[PDB]
Symmetry: C4
Subunit: 325 residues, 4 copies
């Protein structure tokens, strides 16, 4: 119950000794630690330090754990005062968590997993990207009407696979731990499985995801979509409810019309999709006065359905964008 | 007029005793309550508590009712100080209102109205959703050109009605009070009235609203639209003024043209709607130099007309979204 | 130079007497006014009032005019403290301006200019709106292919003019001052000038603006557009620069093509407009590889050109919207 | 170690003399400078000045360089206190940088480079703009089907070049320094190089950029795009990844269809572009159930791809817009 006066650059703080003794590990909790700052003429402990920060420090003793940075104190200045008062590593990491902060194969694992290290590391990454870009150009040219080791496309297709196999064999016996959690390598597995044929071709387009390893923004978008599936799927659900709603509204408004462009419900789905997203079908346009109305409400409700979950998904992207800079 | 000194962890507060006696129910208003905190050596009442919060507490006595949380004090910390100073339940609920905060049938009413309680409660809700989803699929398949108890659709249509009647008979004699205010049950009434035929079919599509009971976001959007009708209808009115304006501007610009695609005013309405919402008609495009101009101004003014009331409606949605989490 | 101590509910303020005597009209500047608050035991002036507000009050004496409300003090509380310290009507109105705040014919001028006064005032406004809405419906029906005092439209056209003349003759000899500045009456003049015929018809559509007097949001949008012409016209200029830019880019990319859909520069203007506003022409689509590219860049740059000046115009609207509530 | 008490209008500040002596150039660091403010009755230095500002001033001595304006202190008031305490020109310019702040030919260089100086300076700028606007109108009329010194267009084309040469010869021997860094003159060079012919015509359209010198907003947009290329190019990259992704998804979904509108991968690129930007092709619309799905996901992912990097680019524009006012 013994009173303790703490002078912070002229700002007076008073408390009970039992409140500071609650945490015997810190500065003000250890009598031998705070001894060097005692003023025997005023019976107080003087500190020639920042003043707005000490409101939360002394409250960390009163509350017995709570360490909230004041809204007017900078983040770096308050964090450097916690080091001086020695509140503890447990309370320091809780402050960051509350603020928002989470030989034979060692050299080959430097110019491949972290291509920003050495000199040849930054060049072998460009060559690996050129193989990917040509791998994408090769996939887009295997279908032209002109074009539809001897096969003129089997010379570059395998050449990229030889490099895409060279981007996997050097990463299995040189990785830290034996790997399937990192999605960067799951893409390397789906880019190297051309051993049902159409499903493997739709699976073959996943070689575009090979750029995510070497791209700055692709990593940011990947974290955004994962950290937004609730509001990301909320759009898909809100659009599903509206498509079923408005495709049926235009169908009953254009049912007695012998030349009504909407024959059934599912045939009016794609019309409601491009009218909500405001893309524009060009084909199925309404003809009935009531059907024309339904199209107007389908375009108005479309902008609302889209623009509601977007700011949340935009905010998740702008956070990871700035945090990675 | 007797002066009273209040020491808050070193922060000095002075007032007149009549100001604290204005509220005899609280701590500082009751002399017997504040007796335990008096310091007879300094003639003051000491409190080893939070310091930035007491500005508003002592002002609650001076203003005689006003209790405004300081902008730099957290919401939980300030609210816990009101409990200590015992300002009263009337002033506490006014603070929340000012901040923004509003046997035979008892067990059957748990696995139906609150399907998150028991184990079988969370399974009977999934079965009830599967019936709804099949009920929606059934409505969309009763119109295909191929398909247009013996009727192949009368086997699932009634089967869902048997379940949709099973989702109403168990809720009338098991509800708390006899019900028409909760819109969740008005949908159950409009999903069970298939006892003018086309109007009942347009009324039949309202079975999609049955998902609002089991959906998280549908409840949020429903509250959003109700709490936004002024700005929601402001869009409909702003778009009505512009459609009448620009449909007449393109009609007089394309009147002497014998092959002008716009014959009258109402026939140019749907063109102005999809050009403001930027959907794209594909059919009626302008042909005259002046009519081409009108279409350009109709698309520019459309983005403005849409994007003005949207942020308000988005803010109403993002509030109910986060408040329900 | 005589020192003056001012005690604000325990918060100590010191200054020189010449600083308070700088404004002899206020409380602390008048010795007879502040006499009632002097404490002859401490040699200070005590005030049992708000504490965070007095930082700016005492600075109003030091700065000699500046009166800035603190960011943590509410607007109503700080404004009520200026009344107590009696800083003057000149400094009070400067604070509002700095914060953001600007018989025979007397009874007939109440149920017409302010239709919210009496009972019959709120009914005669509805009848005046029904005449306007029918006046708009009449204008839209004078052009149907079926329809294209004896003239079936001359019975309602003049009947609304009789009312639109009844909404002008009662406002010239009953107005406060003889009127042309208020744009509400300029619309009444352009709705009553049907005494070159096509220009008067395009001028006749301005009868839709008659709703601005009785509409809540139309007044808000009118103030928004006037308070945004710089950024409103900035869009028109940014779109003008892009239309000329991209219409020429697609024309040179599709010049050697004998069947290029773009014959000249001005014939590609409307394509660039609906591709920037993302409306969709449906007619003129690019055919050349380079022309296809130009269309892609014209759609990307369109969203940027639109979305830059929009938030400013949206902010001007959301300010007048909330300020009128 | 000698203690120093600083009284700021009643607010008490204490520190060690060695902390103020750390900067011997300032007021409180120079004993002769602060001598005029010493109170020999209280042993303190009194200042009749602003109170919330001195937290950062005294911390500038403790931190030994850091000068951060408090979040509640206005920018002008805090900056005027730094002048009084005389912290130094080095710390003052660091505060602005931390806040966000960077005869025979002398008279001819006033009515040309700064056309806001004299009277004839503001008129010769309008004539120079009329030549540019006619130069733009001339370029748009050299291609009409009607029109496709004797050449009817060689009379205005050279007349503008004579003026565009008059806007370069007077700026080379009258400029401050001999010029290629300022992009305003690089446009004057690309507007005066009509001395491969089609490439010079696509290079000739760059005469629209001549308006950037005399336009307020064109300068703001130019700074915006340069200060946004990372997020500006991030859109181009995000759209490139999606176009390749969805053009291949619709091609494999519409491959067995003999009348599939998408013959190859590159022929489906422009469809994915206008469906992501929601422009609307009107030509290539999907026909297969799977292809219809791909178009729906291509329109949903398009709004997301567009709306993510837009707020960053909008914020860069709104900063330069307000900073230039
Ligand atoms: K469109
Ligand atoms: K659109
Ligand atoms: O379209």
């Amino acid at each position: 119950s013994e009173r303790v006066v703490i002078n912070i650059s002229g700002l007076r703080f008073e408390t009970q000794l039992k409140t500071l003794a609650q945490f015997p590990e810190t500065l003000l909790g250890d009598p031998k630690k705070r001894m060097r700052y005692f003023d025997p003429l005023r019976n107080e402990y003087f500190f020639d330090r920042n003043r707005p920060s000490f409101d939360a420090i002394l409250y960390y003793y009163q509350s017995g754990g709570r360490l909230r940075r004041p809204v007017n104190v900078p983040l770096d200045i308050f964090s450097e005062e916690i080091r001086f008062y020695e509140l503890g590593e447990e309370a320091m990491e809780m402050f960051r968590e509350d603020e928002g902060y989470i030989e034979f194969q060692r050299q080959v694992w430097l110019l491949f997993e972290y291509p920003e290290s050495s000199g040849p590391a930054r060049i072998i990454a460009i060559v690996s990207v050129m193989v990917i870009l040509i791998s994408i150009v090769s996939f887009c040219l295997e279908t032209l009407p002109i074009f539809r080791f001897t096969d003129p496309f089997f010379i570059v297709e395998t050449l990229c696979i030889i490099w895409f196999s060279f981007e996997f064999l050097v990463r299995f016996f040189a990785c830290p731990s034996k790997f399937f959690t990192n999605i960067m390598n799951i893409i390397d597995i789906v880019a190297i499985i051309p051993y049902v044929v159409q499903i493997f071709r739709i699976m073959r387009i996943l070689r575009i995801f090979k750029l995510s390893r070497h791209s700055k923004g692709l990593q940011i978008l990947g974290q955004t979509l994962k950290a937004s599936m609730r509001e990301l799927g909320l759009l898909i659900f809100f659009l599903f409810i509206g498509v079923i709603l408005f495709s049926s509204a235009v169908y009953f408004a254009e049912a007695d019309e012998r030349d009504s462009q909407f024959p059934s419900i599912p045939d009016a789905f794609f019309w409601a999709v491009v009218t909500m997203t405001t893309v524009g079908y060009g084909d199925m346009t309404p003809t009935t006065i009531g059907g024309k109305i339904v199209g107007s409400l389908c375009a108005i409700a479309g902008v609302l359905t889209i623009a509601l979950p977007v700011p949340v998904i935009v905010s998740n992207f702008n956070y990871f964008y700035h945090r990675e800079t």
